[PDB]
Design a protein around this ligand. Structure first.
Ligand SMILES: O=C(O)[C@H]1O[C@H](O)[C@H](O)[C@@H](O)[C@H]1O
Length: 300
């Protein structure tokens, strides 16, 4: 039995290679009983589409960002907040530990079973027309965001105007002037070709929202207890493999887009951004559940 697993990214991308590795491990560990087959390039739909398919049992697995789950699984908000993670190592400690496992389990009420997290670096704003040197340069800018209430709030808090849309629609939106900007990590900015539409990469590092690898709960529940354990272990084993590929890809991608003429822009005073964005903590992570998760993250 091969689980069909979706990804928006190309076949060579670290998140796709990681799930392929999970598939190899799972096939071996299960003596051929279980496996994974990956469907890259967004063939099976946008990330929101694949959430819908998992919910109804029409798709077995997806590798998506945690952000489009914000509206479905409130606990994922804690991972996506601005400046909630100090750095990569902080994030990895949190996600690998009990807090990460708790948020994966909290998906079950939505008909989803979280299996593992993959890294997504830090997201930064890239613009078409001009550099962003400070908070003021974002005023009134049309900035694409993922389909998340939190993210709409995050961009509004920067004095800019959010347009939620699926990843695959972003390139043409930048090229045709529908939006002025979007935001993402280095490998996405490269692989999407957004760097060819928006040549200013302004290092804001305003979120470290990670990826999640998720199974349809309906499919999960057809598995034996023992098969479930194998599936989890294969998924977890693929995380360090993903990270080795990812950290290398961040460097390769930055080098490539600089070679293509991208202007890498420094924002001198990030504290401006931290203070501007802080209100979303109470607006979106202010209830008992979320505020507790946020505290425990900060304390790691
Ligand atoms: O901005 C987006 O939609 C995308 O950002 C990253 O590329 C992430 O890896 C994708 O899963 C998706 O979330």
């Amino acid at each position: 039995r091969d689980f069909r697993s979706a990804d928006v990214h190309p076949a060579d991308y670290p998140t796709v290679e990681a799930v392929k590795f999970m598939g190899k491990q799972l096939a071996a560990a299960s003596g051929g009983k279980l496996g994974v087959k990956v469907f890259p390039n967004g063939a099976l739909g946008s990330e929101k589409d694949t959430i819908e398919q998992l919910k109804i049992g029409a798709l077995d697995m997806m590798r998506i960002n945690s952000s489009p789950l914000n509206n479905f699984v409130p606990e994922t908000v804690a991972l996506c907040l601005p400046f909630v993670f100090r750095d990569t190592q902080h994030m990895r400690n949190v996600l690998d530990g009990p807090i990460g496992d708790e948020i994966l389990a909290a998906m079950e009420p939505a008909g989803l079973v979280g299996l593992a997290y993959y890294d997504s670096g830090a997201r930064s704003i890239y613009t078409v027309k001009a550099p962003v040197k400070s908070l003021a340069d974002l005023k009134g800018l049309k900035i694409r965001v993922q389909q998340s209430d939190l993210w709409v709030g995050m961009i509004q808090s920067l004095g800019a105007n959010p347009t939620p849309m699926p990843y695959g629609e972003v390139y043409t939106a930048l090229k045709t002037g529908l939006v002025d900007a979007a935001e993402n990590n280095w490998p996405s900015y490269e692989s999407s070709r957004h760097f060819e539409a928006a040549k200013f990469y302004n290092i804001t590092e305003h979120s470290l929202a990670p990826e999640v690898l998720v199974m349809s709960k309906k499919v999960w529940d057809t598995l034996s207890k023992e098969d479930q354990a194998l599936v989890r272990k294969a998924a977890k084993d693929s995380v360090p493999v993903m990270r080795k590929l990812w950290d290398e890809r961040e460097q390769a991608s930055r080098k490539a887009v600089e070679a293509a003429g991208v202007q890498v822009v420094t924002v001198a005073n990030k504290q401006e951004f931290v203070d501007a964005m802080k209100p979303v903590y109470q607006k979106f992570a202010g209830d008992e559940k979320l505020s507790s998760l946020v505290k425990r993250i900060q304390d790691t």
